[PDB]
Design a protein around this ligand. Structure first.
Ligand SMILES: COc1ccc2c3c(c(Cc4ccc(Cl)cc4)[nH]c13)CCNC2=O
Ligand SMILES: [Mg+2]
Ligand SMILES: [Zn+2]
Length: 287
């Protein structure tokens, strides 16, 4: 309540002053309260606040519920990873100019899903998990005081909930590797068409995974610090890394950021940043 009062009172600096439109954004210098402000600006500047009549103290309270239900004790899968996933969704919608290709309910759902998609993760060494993450998400969404979708009609609410759930489930990398063949497939034959409801849902999944993974695209000093959190979580349950990093980039990351660059050439900095990191890791791998 002490934290909610400060949060609700504060003025929310512009998207420019917060730097949330940059693919190279980083959160290391922000306090919990500042990521909260960044989050309101994301909602506000996607015009989700007015278009769905969100009340300020509810949105505020909803963000703090989401943040609280990530575990500070987990070195990487925590609020900051979720906050960063949402910042990249924001950036890809704005700077990557993907906003225009989607509808309001899709965008509302993507942002809620990005922020919620790992709720209550306890660490890799501790599609079962994603169903739990969605469960948390919905629970918080229904808590009185946090109900940021209350201004949506029942039909809007039902559509938005379905997309949210699909988007969070899509962050299972096993689901991503199962489905990306089809996605890459349609891009290489210039058959890709967002107006097909199946390809729309497919793209939304792939965009969720690209945001989820996007620490791998950051500028080298930021990305290397994220890598330390990953190594901490995976090893310490709390020489070999450069080749793992190259193996992960090749097996999981590069094609996705390549495909996404075809759907919108303004997402190229994610591909660019991924590429720079691969070469820098490769260099280290050769000792
Ligand atoms: C900047 O790098 C990374 C940024 C983000 C992620 C990841 C992963 C990896 C692979 C890995 C795992 C353990 C170790 Cl020890 C090394 C390498 N690297 C990542 C999987 C975890 N999901 C991620 O969001
Ligand atoms: Mg996850
Ligand atoms: Zn995640």
């Amino acid at each position: 309540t002490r934290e909610l009062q400060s949060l609700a009172a504060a003025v929310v600096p512009s998207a420019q002053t917060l730097k949330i439109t940059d693919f190279s954004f980083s959160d290391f210098e922000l306090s919990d309260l500042e990521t909260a402000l960044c989050t309101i600006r994301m909602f506000t500047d996607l015009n989700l606040v007015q278009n769905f009549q969100m009340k300020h103290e509810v949105l505020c309270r909803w963000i703090l519920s989401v943040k609280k239900n990530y575990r500070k004790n987990v070195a990487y899968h925590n609020w900051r990873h979720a906050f960063n996933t949402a910042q990249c969704m924001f950036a890809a919608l704005k700077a990557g100019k993907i906003q225009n290709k989607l509808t309001d309910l899709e965008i509302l759902a993507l942002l809620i899903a990005a922020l919620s998609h790992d709720l209550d993760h306890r660490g890799v060494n501790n599609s079962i998990m994603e169903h739990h993450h969605f469960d948390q998400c919905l629970m918080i969404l229904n808590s009185p005081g946090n109900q940021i979708l209350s201004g949506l009609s029942i039909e809007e609410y039902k559509t938005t909930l379905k997309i949210i759930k699909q988007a969070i489930l899509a962050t299972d990398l096993a689901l991503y590797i199962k489905r990306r063949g089809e996605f890459f497939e349609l891009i290489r034959k210039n058959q890709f068409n967002l107006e097909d409801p199946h390809q729309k849902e497919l793209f939304l999944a792939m965009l969720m995974t690209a945001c989820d993974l996007s620490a791998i695209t950051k500028p080298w000093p930021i990305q290397q610090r994220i890598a330390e959190l990953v190594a901490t979580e995976f090893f310490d349950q709390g020489n070999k890394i450069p080749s793992m990093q190259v193996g992960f980039i090749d097996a999981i990351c590069l094609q996705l950021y390549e495909a996404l660059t075809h759907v919108s050439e303004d997402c190229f900095p994610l591909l660019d940043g991924c590429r720079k990191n691969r070469q820098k890791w490769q260099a280290l791998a050769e000792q």
